[PDB]
Amino acid sequence: SDLDKKLLEAARAGQDDEVRILMANGADVNARDSYGSTPLHLAAREGHLEIVEVLLKYGADVNAADFIGDTPLHLAAYRGHLEIVEVLLKYGADVNASDITGETPLHLAAQIGHLEIVEVLLKHGADVNAQDKFGKTPADIAADNGHEDIAEVLQKLN
């Protein structure tokens, strides 16, 4: 719908009052765009912390998956938004959610090189043995991509 499109746009753009007003007028908090992204996906990806909190407070599906199987937690872990990762986990995000090629949030944090996020994911039960469809554990990805600090952390855990 028109309202749903406006809500997706407001969440992506970081417009807090607009998100609230659109939802009050009936915009679906779990509206989907052509990529299968929800407003929460977009706010989490773009690093809009307060909007993530607003969406979750007002009923967003914390574990919504887009058309390639990514959840908001995957996107925050990939981009490097630590506080958002923490809030998503508090609201029940699946720490071991697997996307189209079997990447977990820990795989993505290892890919892009976000050490503090790796540690948060580990402390919340991320599976260090998880293999993606390329046969890679998060430790394999960290080593492959030259993220030595992360590889060193993961090596202590086997």
| 59 vs 95: CA distance, rounded Å | 19
Residue 79: which of 53, 61, 52 has the closest Cα? 52
The DSSP 8-state label assigned to residue 16 in this structure reads H
Number of domains comprising the chain: 1
| 4 vs 6: CA distance, rounded Å | 5
Residue 14's CB: how many other CB atoms inside 10 A? Answer: 16
Two tokens at 149? Answer: 């600090």
In the chain, helix, strand, coil percent, each to 5? 55, 0, 45
Two tokens at 96? Answer: 């071991």
Q: List CB contacts of 13: < 8 A, sequence separation 6 or more.
A: none
Residue 143 and residue 134 in contact, taking contact as beta carbons nearer than 8 Å: no
Two tokens at 99? Answer: 């996307």
Number of alpha carbons in the 13 Å side-chain half-sphere of residue 3 = 11
Burial class (CB in 10 A: 0-12, 13-18, 19+), 128: middle
Number of alpha carbons in the 13 Å side-chain half-sphere of residue 112 = 18
Two tokens at 116? Answer: 């503090």
CATH number reported for the structural domain that contains residue 126 in this entry: 1.25.40.20
Residue 59: which of 38, 37, 30, 87 has the closest Cα? 30
Tell me how the structure was determined: X-ray
Give the three-state DSSP class for 9. helix
Residue 7: which of 48, 42, 53, 56 has the closest Cα? 42
| 141 vs 71: CA distance, rounded Å | 20
Residue 109 and residue 79 in contact, taking contact as beta carbons nearer than 8 Å: no
| 93 vs 90: CA distance, rounded Å | 7
Residue 79: which of 51, 42, 54 has the closest Cα? 42
Which position has the token pair 């998880």?
Answer: 130
| 110 vs 51: CA distance, rounded Å | 26
Residue 131: which of 104, 156, 158 has the closest Cα? 104
Query: What is the domain range of residue 42?
Result: 1-158
Residue 109 and residue 117 in contact, taking contact as beta carbons nearer than 8 Å: yes
- Resolution of the entry in angstroms: 1.4
